[PDB]
Design a protein around this nucleic acid. Sequence first.
RNA 1: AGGA
Length: 594
Amino acid sequence: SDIQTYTSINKYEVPPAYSRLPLTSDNFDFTPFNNTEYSGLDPDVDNHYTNAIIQLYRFIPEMFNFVVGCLKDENFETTLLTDLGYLFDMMERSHGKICSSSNFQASLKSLTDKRQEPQEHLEEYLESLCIESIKRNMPQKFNRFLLSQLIKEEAQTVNHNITLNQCFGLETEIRTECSCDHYDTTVKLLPSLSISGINKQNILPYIEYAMKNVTQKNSETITQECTVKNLPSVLSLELSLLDTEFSNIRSSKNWLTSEFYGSIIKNKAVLRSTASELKGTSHIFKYELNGYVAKITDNNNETRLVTYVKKYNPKENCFKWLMFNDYLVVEITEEEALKMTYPWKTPEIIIYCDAEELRKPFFSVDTYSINYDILFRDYFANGIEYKLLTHDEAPKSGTLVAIDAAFVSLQSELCEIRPKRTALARISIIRGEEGELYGVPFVDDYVVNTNHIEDYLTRYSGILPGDLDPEKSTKRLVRRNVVYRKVWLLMQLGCVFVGHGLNNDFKHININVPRNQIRDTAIYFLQGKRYLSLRYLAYVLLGMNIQEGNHDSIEDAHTALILYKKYLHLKEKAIFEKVLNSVYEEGRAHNFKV
RNA sequence: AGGA
């Protein structure tokens, strides 16, 4: 469609790659939007600027390997850390396939609404989610919040870690003269740097001023001098200043430095362009640009964020650059990624990583020893017909399980401008392997959703108003983070999933399961258009028919199991193709009714 | 139409 073009002939003409993309809304061909194995994010979210920032922290080896590395152990208390881990892990699994951050965003909204770090952190993030139109100096405001929320939660995981402080930690001592000849210092470990209205090129002078500056402003005119004597592994900058000075950045050739050298000699910090021109003491490190997030002012005068990314190749010692839109993913050259001459380009969040540490490969969770203990026990929140797991039933790379989920609606379409909200409510998984414990369920759990729902859909989902955890119908009610882990482990071990319309369930549980692990009875029993109903298909291929009233997931998952078993029968003997049309004639002439 |  001539959209992956990321360049043009005029500086004012924005390439089609940086344009607004249409909503996903339903099968959507994504093959003309990304030809690489690096996935994109579904833009059908409430707060849209967060998608660009998650992609930035994806391609840091230290940032990625830790958040994914926290998935071996069960940490449900830390919501934003594990939901980002699920998101980071699933995006690497997709290998180009579409991904959604809806589960990560539902955890960020619930954590923010719990305000009943300063409160100004959470209060600002709440207003932007409910109303995308990029505001002034808002994306970096979320950057400081995200890292600070990760640092706080990182110290609360099991076998508590400080790995994120050993990578983002900026030991900044803030000295202030309270009176004549009386110094007062504060030692605060900040996760990211901020750019102010610096006075009088290149980017290095702006970084040096942010690490050693002298200001005069207080509640009298008390001068304050804050400096940092630490060089962390990844250096996250929150660049924000005036437009009149932003226009001067456009004219400065090669303003964004790709690689640079710098260390501390005196109480200040100095950064040099080449390894020869630097001076001072013995040791000095090298920093390379790992990526940055820039805003695009459209020609229709609208705004959105993109993410530039550099990733190392261990085979060939070179750097492959990438530009990440919502789902528009392109491989670009380094000359085009560092170009700031375009007036619509405005860099907002720039990060630098250690040169020797950027070359570190990305390690998945598969390399660690994962703990699958949640599958064998219960984790009911409130104290108040199935059989749970035994250690003999060890799920293998080919274990059959029948899955069916049901969920309620939260919001409406809200057109004008896309349908937005539908959160998981109930999910039940069945044993698929033949034997004594065959066709019986092992996990039948509810979510703990407390948000104001709009419609329960009692006729289709078949749940009662009992999702308020302690109030109504405490029947194996459990959280949403815990049950996801149960589903995530089965996909991790390689269990094959059977059911009806399984692609739709995974879209709202927000987990991507590969093709060779899904056995969808809807696709197996598909003949062109007019997908068949599960209750109608059971009443014409088998004998069970409970009038299809107030659907239950334990039933829909059990009939979908034997419907699969009936498929292998009609497939072992050369029957299925003949019966595949036999049901059609009985359906076309009966209007698909019981 | 399935899918809730």
